[PDB]
């Protein structure tokens, strides 16, 4: 089972809202090269590679662990879509 | 209501009824082309029969054959004996056959892929 899956299901009214939030966050993370993450450096998911320990490339894994921290805000009609994309590029030019 | 009788018969795009050369070298084609050719041959012959002032018996037979050619193109085997290509007893696959059934477009290419 995914870590904290019970907690993830408990934070949303519909289980499919959780999937939408995770997937949308994952593409936000992929779009900005994980520079927009809310995870602390010690909280970054890691990959055990023959060349050493590296960051986990799977953004879905990152998105699920970010939602467990509680630093992400999700909902409907929070901000305009155009303003969200423009503002997040300003903070994270990537 | 008179649109239920066809004056112009739509022709399917050729790539949906392809005539392709296989790697061996022989050509492969869909049954619709044979169904279309029969309609064109009978329609063209009716035009020449009418131009020659043929008797009504000949004209009546050609018009009846024209109606059956249209029926075979749209729904082969629905009325009368199914149209088959020479050398085989396999009924030609009409437009209705392509869309209906378990092998039809809906259940073989749209509901599952």
């Amino acid at each position: 089972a995914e870590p904290g899956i019970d907690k993830l299901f408990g934070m949303v009214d519909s289980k499919y809202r959780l999937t939408v939030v995770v997937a949308k966050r994952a593409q936000q993370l992929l779009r900005h090269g994980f520079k927009n993450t809310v995870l602390e450096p010690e909280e970054r998911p890691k990959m055990q590679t023959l060349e050493g320990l590296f960051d986990d490339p799977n953004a879905v894994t990152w998105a699920m662990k970010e939602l467990l921290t509680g630093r992400l805000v999700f909902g409907e009609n929070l901000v305009p879509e155009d303003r969200l994309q423009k503002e997040m590029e300003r903070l994270y030019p990537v | 209501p008179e649109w239920m009788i066809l004056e112009a018969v739509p022709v399917l795009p050729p790539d949906l009824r392809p005539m392709v050369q296989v790697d061996g070298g022989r050509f492969a084609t869909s049954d619709l082309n044979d169904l279309y050719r029969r309609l064109i041959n009978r329609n063209n012959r009716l035009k020449k029969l009418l131009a020659q002032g043929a008797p009504e018996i000949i004209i009546r037979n050609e018009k009846r054959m024209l109606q059956e050619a249209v029926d075979a193109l749209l729904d082969n085997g629905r009325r009368g004996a199914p149209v088959t290509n020479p050398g085989s007893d396999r009924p030609l696959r009409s437009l209705t056959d392509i869309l209906s059934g378990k092998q039809g477009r809906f259940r073989q290419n749209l509901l599952g892929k």
């Binding site: - | 070298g25 749209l110 599952g112 892929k113």
Partner: protein, 1113 residues
């Protein structure tokens, strides 16, 4: 190694030739060896005498005799050159001028008749094929009760298939008897007037059955003459057709009286006489003589119908599934039927050429065009459902295929019309059709097997042998007798105790019309020959068959057909006694023709000096590729100077060991769960099997390529492939073909071929790219043949056939064809399917090292670990008894023959286990070893489970466990014993043709369909997996909308989407938003072709173009 034979039943007669259903019927049809003047009126000879004379009328073309020449090419050459093994057919025809009185005789060439090989198969276009026998309703006269009207019966007259219309006689509720012909119902009274019947005659013959004859009384039709009623009948049958007398008489003659068009058949005629108590002169419903119609069968048919309806004694309904009412059409009859059809087509073309004229110089050669006859024969052996690609995985596979009985095929049943009645085991299947061997699934009960002792007679009815019993003593007289003849006798069971030849039991188990009864010995009239006659060959190879449930015995018999030959194949420790006969009758092994001495022994051939002095050289089939790809080789089993008797084995064939059928290995089996690797039929094996090359099989794959003529230039098979380095061309010889003995892996070139590129200007990016590097584009491209993914091996044979070669009939435009054979030695791996003869099957899920396997106290590890949870629900206890007998034979160094239903029983297996214990444990005592501490612990638990008697010595308790087939077994991982004794024994396990090597497939992107633009299907086409409606339902139920949409669009047929998805992924980007599938665009266009205006609209009902403006004028 001695063979101990069990059983008490003495078989008076041996098994008949197991391929005689194929061999004898085709010999009877051809009649190639009998001189023409002594040919009987059967087979193709009957076909000639029925179609000829072709009297156009006045020219008459008569048939005198036919002959079959020697085949142009040998069987091996036909296979190599994709030729049909056939014999030329010549008919000696004479043309007679009725006016002039001149006869012109010449021999015309009618084409080629495919020849059956010795083993009973055909070589059609170089491929081995088997004609499967067909079962159908026998022709004749039948009387079935009306289900709608109780107390009413209908009379059915059935001719040979496609040889006339079915005739139904039924007493209508109003009273008149109705004849239904060609779906037209008309009163039968009118027909009898045509056939010359008076009112007084009908009252005399059928007036003694109630008032039913009153319904056969119409004063209108008795008033009219038979000629007037004939026209009256013609109007009903063919309304609107001008009712001329000559036209009317021809129709009625061709409906019930024309021998060339109506044929009741020899079986149908015989059934009609037996049922109606009459004597037919011919095989037609009526005869036309002296310009009038004479009745032959309608009066006896109607007389029986009225008598059956009146309830008179001696009249009964007919069971249509009774095997006396169902006959077999063998290869001879099926070929002859198609031969007659082609001959009728040839005769029709002769008449039209006679109509043309030019009779001054007309010769029989000019009139005869053999092409209609050749086409019909070619169609039967190529595109018939009953003509099937020969199954030759192992020699038993081909033997079963030649004995298959199919209810399907042309003139047969379909699964829609196949209800429970046709698929059930009828009581008359006893001794004629195996009640076990059948395909599970949609074809159950529709494809069956001939019983081992059963044989098909001349009329097509299956007869089974019985021993005559008179005065309570059983004689050696054997009577082969049909199901309808069997119903007249009380037949005892073959297991009835016998004191010498006299029945010793006072109560005898017998059958009376298939029902089990207890009778006195004096009431017994016949006896079963053996228990083996009930079952087919495959079922007869299952030891302890009586201990297995029928559903699992079906699986065991079917999977013996799927066993692959093994390089170290062994005959089973426990046999049934038919292993030798299967090999002998398969003709896969080689035997001495008579007594003699072996002169030369080699892997290629054997030379024997027979007593008469002649030298006979037998070439050995070596590493031949079967239809299924299994390697078929014959290995010599004699040495130079060895004296051989008549019938002595000379060389073992595929899957044979010293003349015994060897479909697998004999392995040490422990029946116990093992760490979940036995879960749900999964099987654990030892690595020791791989070390000694058990379950190692040789498989050969054939690869073909053609060099073609093309408008832009011919394809060249050469070693000079552009843009390829020396590493890729290293194994190719100067001709461009891979060298023999080279190892080829996926992606390696088997043969180099260059094809001229189609004339098309390159993209400007390529034009700039080529200009920078200063390389001029070549005129040819890489179209060479390469090893498909997951395949490969060792090149062992290259066959190159060129245009103009003798016997090589290449298609036009093909200059040459190159065939490369690649052989791989396949060892047992995870995912390979193993099975025993009792229906226990499973894939290897784990291969353990020897030190991890459970082992005996003497250190011997087991080979295979089977889950005991597969036994109880499947109820196949024969494997357990095989394991127990195998355990005794493993230590006694002996093998066993236990015939089914008469063989090794538990008391006699246990006394073998007692002797096996004395070498199992007595050897330990001599070596200076007592009882293990670990064994003492297991014995302590064993008495708590009630398995051993308390108070006995450890040796005695170990013997008690051994008599139950159980031993103390040590865990190789820990050294501690298994807490309970484990059933350990030697069992025969087969390696099946389903291998994970041939089944594993994957695809990222590949070929797409022409119209739907969706991925193709099949591993051979590198296709994608089918995501059908039910899989779509699963994603919908999960709410995985985006996963569903990708499979619908991005991964199947969104052309823009799938290109953009692949480009995004290789750039490290996420796939874009999907678009409309191309199949929906196809659907819209096809709906427009049906003159339907289908439009996609937006929120505001405005039209939305899904064709990107490409279809808007």
């Amino acid at each position: 190694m001695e063979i101990k034979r069990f059983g008490r039943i003495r078989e008076v007669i041996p098994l008949p030739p197991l391929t005689e259903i194929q061999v004898e019927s085709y010999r009877r049809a051809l009649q190639a060896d009998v001189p023409p003047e002594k040919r009987e009126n059967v087979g193709i000879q009957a076909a000639f005498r029925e179609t000829f004379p072709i009297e156009e009328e006045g020219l008459v073309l008569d048939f005198l005799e036919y002959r079959l020449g020697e085949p142009p090419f040998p069987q091996d050459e036909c296979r190599e050159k994709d030729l049909t093994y056939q014999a030329p057919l010549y008919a000696r025809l004479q043309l007679i001028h009725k006016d002039t009185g001149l006869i012109k005789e010449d021999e015309v060439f009618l084409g080629h008749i495919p020849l059956m090989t010795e083993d009973g198969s055909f070589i059609i276009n170089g491929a081995d094929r088997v004609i499967v026998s067909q079962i159908h309703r026998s022709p004749g006269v039948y009387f079935t009760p009306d289900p709608a009207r109780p107390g009413r019966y209908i009379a059915s007259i059935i001719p040979l298939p496609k040889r006339g219309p079915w005739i139904d006689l039924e007493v209508e509720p109003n009273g008149v008897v109705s004849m239904k012909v060609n779906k037209r119902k008309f009163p039968l009274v009118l027909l009898l007037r045509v056939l010359g019947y008076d009112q007084e005659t009908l009252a005399r013959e059928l007036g003694a059955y109630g008032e039913l004859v009153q319904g056969l009384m119409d004063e209108s039709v008795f008033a009219m003459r038979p000629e007037e009623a004939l026209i009256r009948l013609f109007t009903l049958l063919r309304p609107g057709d001008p009712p001329k007398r000559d036209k009317a008489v021809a129709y009625v003659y061709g409906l019930i009286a024309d021998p060339r068009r109506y044929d009741l058949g020899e079986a149908g005629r015989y059934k009609a006489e037996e049922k109606l108590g009459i004597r037919l002169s011919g095989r037609t419903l009526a005869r036309f003589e002296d310009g009038e119609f004479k009745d032959e069968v309608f009066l006896p048919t109607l007389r029986y119908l009225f008598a059956l309806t009146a309830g008179v004694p001696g009249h009964e309904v007919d069971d249509i599934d009774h095997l006396g009412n169902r006959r077999i059409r063998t290869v001879g009859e099926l070929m002859t039927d198609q031969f007659r059809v082609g001959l009728a087509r040839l005769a029709r073309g002769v008449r039209e050429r006679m109509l043309m004229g030019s009779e001054d110089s007309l010769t029989p050669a000019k009139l005869v065009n053999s092409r209609p006859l050749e086409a019909a024969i070619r169609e039967f052996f190529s595109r018939s459902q009953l003509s099937q690609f020969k199954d030759e995985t192992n020699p038993l596979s081909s033997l079963r295929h030649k004995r298959r009985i199919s209810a399907l095929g042309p003139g047969g049943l379909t699964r829609e019309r196949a209800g429970f009645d046709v698929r059930d085991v009828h009581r008359t299947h006893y001794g004629r059709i195996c009640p076990v061997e059948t395909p599970e699934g949609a074809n159950i009960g529709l494809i069956t097997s001939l019983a081992a002792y059963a044989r098909v007679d001349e009329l097509g009815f299956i007869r089974t042998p019985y021993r005559r019993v008179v005065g309570g003593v059983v004689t050696d007289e054997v009577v082969y007798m049909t199901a309808t003849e069997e119903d007249r006798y009380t037949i005892a069971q073959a297991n009835t105790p016998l004191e010498g030849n006299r029945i010793a039991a006072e109560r005898v188990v017998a059958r009376r019309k298939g029902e089990p009864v207890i009778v006195s010995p004096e009431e017994v009239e016949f006896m079963d020959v053996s228990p083996k006659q009930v079952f087919s060959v495959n079922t007869n190879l299952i030891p302890f068959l009586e201990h297995d449930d029928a559903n699992r015995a079906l699986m065991g018999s079917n999977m013996q057909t799927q066993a692959v030959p093994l390089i170290r194949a062994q005959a089973p420790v426990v046999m049934t006694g038919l292993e030798e006969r299967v090999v002998r009758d398969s003709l896969a092994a080689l035997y001495a023709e008579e007594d003699g001495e072996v002169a030369k022994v080699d892997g290629n051939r054997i030379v024997v000096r027979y007593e008469d002095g002649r030298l006979v050289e037998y070439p050995l089939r070596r590493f031949y590729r079967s239809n299924q790809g299994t390697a078929l080789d014959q290995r010599p089993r004699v040495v130079v100077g060895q004296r051989v008797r008549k019938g002595d084995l000379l060389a073992d064939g595929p899957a044979s060991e010293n003349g015994f059928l060897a479909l697998g290995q004999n392995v040490l089996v422990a029946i116990m769960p093992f760490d979940g690797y036995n879960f749900e039929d999964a099987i654990v094996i030892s690595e020791e099997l791989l070390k000694r090359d058990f379950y190692t099989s040789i498989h050969i794959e054939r690869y073909e390529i053609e060099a073609r003529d093309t408008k832009l230039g011919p394809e060249r098979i050469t070693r000079d492939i552009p843009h390829l380095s020396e590493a890729a061309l290293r194994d190719l010889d100067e001709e461009g073909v891979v060298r023999i003995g080279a190892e080829v892996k996926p992606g390696d070139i088997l043969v180099g071929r260059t094809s001229f590129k189609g004339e098309s200007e390159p993209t400007p990016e390529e034009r700039l790219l080529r200009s920078i590097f200063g390389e001029k584009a070549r005129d040819v491209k890489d179209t060479s043949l390469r090893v498909p993914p997951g395949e490969g091996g060792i090149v062992v044979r290259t066959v190159r056939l060129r245009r103009g070669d003798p016997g090589v009939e290449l298609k036009p435009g093909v200059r040459e064809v190159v065939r490369v054979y690649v052989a791989q030695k396949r060892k047992l791996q995870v995912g390979d399917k193993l099975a025993n003869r009792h229906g226990n099957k499973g894939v290897v899920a784990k291969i353990l090292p020897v030190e991890d396997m459970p082992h005996l106290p003497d250190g011997t590890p087991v080979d295979v670990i089977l889950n005991p949870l597969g036994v109880p629900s499947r109820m196949n206890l024969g494997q357990i008894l095989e394991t127990h007998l195998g355990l005794a034979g493993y230590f006694l160094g002996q093998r066993y023959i236990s015939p089914i239903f008469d063989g090794a029983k538990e008391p006699e297996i246990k006394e073998l286990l007692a002797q096996a214990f004395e070498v199992y444990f007595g050897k330990r005592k001599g070596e200076g070893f007592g009882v293990d501490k670990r064994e003492v612990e297991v014995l302590r638990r064993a008495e708590k489970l009630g398995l051993v008697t308390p108070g006995k010595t450890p040796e005695e308790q170990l013997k008690e466990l051994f008599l139950q087939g159980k031993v103390v077994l040590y865990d190789g991982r820990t050294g501690e014993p298994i807490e309970g004794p484990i059933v350990v024994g030697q069992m025969f396990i087969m390696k099946l043709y389903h291998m994970v090597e041939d089944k594993m497939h994957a695809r990222s992107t590949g070929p797409y369909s022409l119209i739907t633009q969706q991925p193709l299907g099949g591993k051979a086409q590198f296709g994608g997996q089918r995501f059908g409606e039910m899989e779509v339902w699963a994603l919908e139920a999960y709410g995985a909308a985006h996963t569903l949409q990708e499979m619908l669009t991005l991964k199947s047929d969104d052309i823009e989407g799938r290109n953009a998805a692949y480009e995004a992924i290789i750039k490290g980007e996420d796939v874009p938003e999907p678009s409309v599938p191309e199949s929906f665009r196809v659907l819209v266009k096809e709906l427009q072709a049906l003159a339907l205006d289908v439009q996609t609209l937006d929120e505001k009902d405005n039209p939305v173009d899904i064709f990107e403006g490409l279809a808007s004028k």
